[PDB]
């Protein structure tokens, strides 16, 4: 296992049943890959820089984890099959290099 | 007889020609012009003067629909890339904002031998 930040970006216009549902299946995805959850950040609505899926904005989550490294890929493919998920980034954590330090 | 208020003006300038197209606030055109629209034929189509004449012309034709406020969008290079926006201002169209949009790739396509 190693430390990875995950980011998910999905369609803004989801209601509560929907939004909470995609969250649930995301959870079930992490579980199903052996992904342990160190913490979560939820910003949600953000006005994007350029449109994504014909959309002026997006909905943003961030999931820090620890998990096996033969998994992390296939993990991300299942995370991305969802129609309503527009981007998936996964990055292994790095300690914060500071400038104007 | 669309009766068009305000709108946008594209200036596509090249080394062989200048062309000006006028449009509504969502992008559908109104009229247009080019250097060869007016009488010019060859190289003469890429003078600055050409660029002028065309700008003006396109403007006259636009004012025909009732155009007033114009937001300008420039693409390309050549003489009268600028003479176009100059006699676009002199026209009587009161120009809202100029913008240069000239598109460039992030590098995908091989160019013509002419080009590298």
């Amino acid at each position: 296992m190693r430390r990875y930040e995950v980011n998910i970006v999905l369609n803004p216009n989801l209601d509560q049943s929907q939004l909470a549902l995609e969250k649930e299946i995301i959870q079930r995805a992490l579980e199903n890959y052996g992904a342990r959850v160190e913490k979560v950040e939820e910003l949600g609505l953000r006005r994007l820089a350029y449109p994504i899926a014909k959309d002026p904005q997006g909905y943003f989550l961030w999931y820090q984890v620890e998990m096996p490294e033969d998994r992390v890929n296939d993990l991300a493919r299942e995370l991305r099959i969802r129609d309503n998920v527009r981007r998936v980034m996964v990055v292994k954590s790095q300690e914060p290099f500071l400038a104007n330090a | 007889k669309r009766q068009v208020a305000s709108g946008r003006a594209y200036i596509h300038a090249s080394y062989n020609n200048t062309i000006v197209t006028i449009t509504d606030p969502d992008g559908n055109p109104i009229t247009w012009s080019s250097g060869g629209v007016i009488g010019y034929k060859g190289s003469r189509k890429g003078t600055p003067y050409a660029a002028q004449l065309a700008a003006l012309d396109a403007a006259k034709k636009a004012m025909a629909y009732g155009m007033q406020s114009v937001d300008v969008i420039v693409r390309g290079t050549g003489a009268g890339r600028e003479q176009a926006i100059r006699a676009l201002q002199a026209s009587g169209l009161q120009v809202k904002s100029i913008v240069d949009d000239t598109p460039v790739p992030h590098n995908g396509c091989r160019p013509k031998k002419k080009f590298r």
Partner: protein, 70 residues
Amino acid sequence: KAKVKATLGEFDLRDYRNVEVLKRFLSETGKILPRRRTGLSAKEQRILAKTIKRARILGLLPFTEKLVRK
């Protein structure tokens, strides 16, 4: 002429999610700014580079914009 880090806090050059800071490194057009403007160091700049492009892919930072005046 102000450099960038000349005016800025003690800030993470890593973090691809913070836009408010990262934007301050681009021209009007979405272009990453040269050392000559960002006043960075070698490895400083070079980390900034990557952290921006991650931001871009994430759609929090633009790949390009257009030139006004002109």
